[PDB]
Amino acid sequence: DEAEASKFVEEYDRTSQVVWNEYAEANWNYNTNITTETSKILLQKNMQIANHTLKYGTQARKFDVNQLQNTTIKRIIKKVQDLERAALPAQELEEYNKILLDMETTYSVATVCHPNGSCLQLEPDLTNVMATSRKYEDLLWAWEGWRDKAGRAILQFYPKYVELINQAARLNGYVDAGDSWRSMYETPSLEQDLERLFQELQPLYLNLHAYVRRALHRHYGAQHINLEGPIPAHLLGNMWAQTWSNIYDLVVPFPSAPSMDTTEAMLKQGWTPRRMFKEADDFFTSLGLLPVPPEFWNKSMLEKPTDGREVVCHASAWDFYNGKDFRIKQCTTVNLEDLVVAHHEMGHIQYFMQYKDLPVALREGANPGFHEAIGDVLALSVSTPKHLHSLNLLSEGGSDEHDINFLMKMALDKIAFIPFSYLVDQWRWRVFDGSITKENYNQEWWSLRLKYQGLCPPVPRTQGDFDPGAKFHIPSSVPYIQYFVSFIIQFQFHEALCQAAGHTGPLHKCDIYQSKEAGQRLATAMKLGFSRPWPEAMQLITGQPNMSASAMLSYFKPLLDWLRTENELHGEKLGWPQYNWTPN
Ligand SMILES: *[C@@H]1O[C@H](CO)[C@@H](O[C@@H]2O[C@H](CO)[C@@H](O[C@@H]3O[C@H](CO)[C@@H](O)[C@H](O)[C@@H]3O)[C@H](O)[C@H]2NC(C)=O)[C@H](O)[C@H]1NC(C)=O
Ligand SMILES: [Cl-]
Ligand SMILES: [Zn+2]
């Protein structure tokens, strides 16, 4: 009856803490020390956690969740009824676990080399090339090289991966893996809600796109930019053209109003990766939110190791299910882009700390988008010229020209990301549901790159190419839609918190630093964890239960008016009517 259900939940929680804590550190040691020994221990602990998941997941399935009164106990048991990979027969499970490891390792050790010269890693080398080089062929070298070495090498593993992850999904009651991933949001209208939100950001994105295309035309020449076509994917300062902020020097709306070199400022003033996290820690505590434990500073990998060992460099935050042990793993470079990233990862850590008293099953964000959005919200305030100047990193100010410059800087990071973050799982959901087969992987990737982002490949794609594999989340099997949700909702959070802090006038000038009223709304929402449906947490922060693009539109409203006037006087076509155009 009801007593057996709550007894089971107690027992699940006690044993999960112990086994999840042990899997986490085995996983940590591989991620921070990629060897054969650490690989083998991880694969052994994989079967141990599966053994636990199988045991309690089988017991969970004997209960009737909707025939149980307490909804909190109902919520936990339903979740435990999902075995994930542990639903696969023993042979399939080890094959799947090996495939995952082999995709992750291949991506992380991939290098692009000159014939008789240096071998370059993605971070920081190729990253730096995409950010700083302004030569078409040198950008092309890194862009094509990374796809030849990382993307092409992932292709051999992917079809089998898709089969095994879909098999696990079906055995847990889903139709495919995409269906399983979407279920995390507990929102029947998810796909429609997301498309509506994407459509609302069209006026802003098409105008940014057109403006940037014009500036690329000016710099890279008329023979390489079609003013009515898609932009070549290697020219936006980022390996995946997901954020366009590194090409700010090519697009600055008012060159007469220049801003400080932030990296030069950081490096000169002796900014260390450690200081960047200390400053993020300060922002959280200023809001009355929890500080990171002394253990965090002892066990975290806050920069790339010098011992010449292989690591997973991608930035991640870690919960060890201790209630005491939380870590960040990041190959941090001393610049503004990574300062934003440091806050984002610290946002994860705060979330871990805020819901640490809940049963481990409920230890997750309201939805995965919420988990991503926390650090980004605070970072929106750090990014203001007024806050950056107070860190001695800028000098921008009370001026209309500097104001439009800042909004362009923010838009190249925030608006540009919208179509990309949307695109990734659109391709992926259709791969899981069978709409896209291995014969059309890459072609359907680029149809969507064209359709949503208005980008084209600088070099025509050949057989054997698998460019999705050259993006971290693909071989690592981490979903991507949260980042889309995060970017919409983080402005909703920013708007509400700014109001709660008593700030008036344009939204983009708001800095919530030290606001205890804003901290309170965040804390109460974060404490809920995964115990309640997400619209409850949305309500707690914003005073309303919906996802909405209004906050983002309002934030960038001054920029949209400026972009419309600017694109109008140059006679720009919005979009890419000549959609079949590729470089000669
Ligand atoms: C359904 O079962 C759940 C879980 O057993 C019940 O939720 C629990 O309710 C108690 C209060 O009735 C919560 O305790 C409170 O929180 C802290 C303790 O850490 C304390 O500072 C407060 O003063 C208060 O005692 C407890 O946290 C909460 N547990 C969870 C996991 O949410 C719930 O009451 C049951 N529902 C019904 C309708 O009976
Ligand atoms: Cl690509
Ligand atoms: Zn994140």
Can you put this structure into words, describing what you see?
The longest helix is centred in the first third of the chain and has 30 residues, at 2-31. This protein has one domain (1-584). It has 25 helices and six strands. By secondary structure, it is mainly alpha-helical. Helix 15 crosses helix 16 (368-382), helix 18 crosses helix 25 and helix 19 (417-432) packs antiparallel against helix 20 (441-453). The strands form three sheets. The chain has a two-stranded antiparallel ribbon with strand order 1-2. Strands 3-6 form a two-stranded parallel sheet. A hairpin with a 5-residue loop joins strand 1 and strand 2. The chain binds a molecule of 3 linked components (NAG-NAG-BMA), chloride ion and zinc ion. Residues 70, 72-73, 357-359, 531 line the site of a molecule of 3 linked components (NAG-NAG-BMA). Zn(2+) 2 binds at residues 344, 348, 372. Disulfide bonds join 113-119, 313-331, 498-510. Chloride 2 binds at residues 147, 445, 449.
Key words describing this protein structure:
25 helices; globular; binds zinc ion; 584 residues; mainly alpha; two-stranded parallel ribbon
Q: In one word, what is the shape?
A: globular
Number of helices: 25
How many distinct domains?
1
What bound compounds does this protein have? Answer: a molecule of 3 linked components (NAG-NAG-BMA), chloride ion, zinc ion
Q: Strand order across the biggest sheet?
A: 1-2
Using only C-alpha atoms, the radius of gyration works out to 24 Å
Structural class: mainly alpha
Total strand segments: 6
* Measured distance between first and last alpha carbons: 71 Å
Subunit structure: Monomer and homodimer; homodimerizes following binding to an inhibitor. Interacts with calmodulin (CALM1, CALM2 or CALM3); interaction takes place in the cytoplasmic region and regulates phosphorylation and proteolytic cleavage.
GO molecular function: actin binding; bradykinin receptor binding; calmodulin binding; chloride ion binding; endopeptidase activity; exopeptidase activity; metallocarboxypeptidase activity; metallodipeptidase activity
Protein name: Angiotensin-converting enzyme
Disulfide bonds: 113-119, 313-331, 498-510
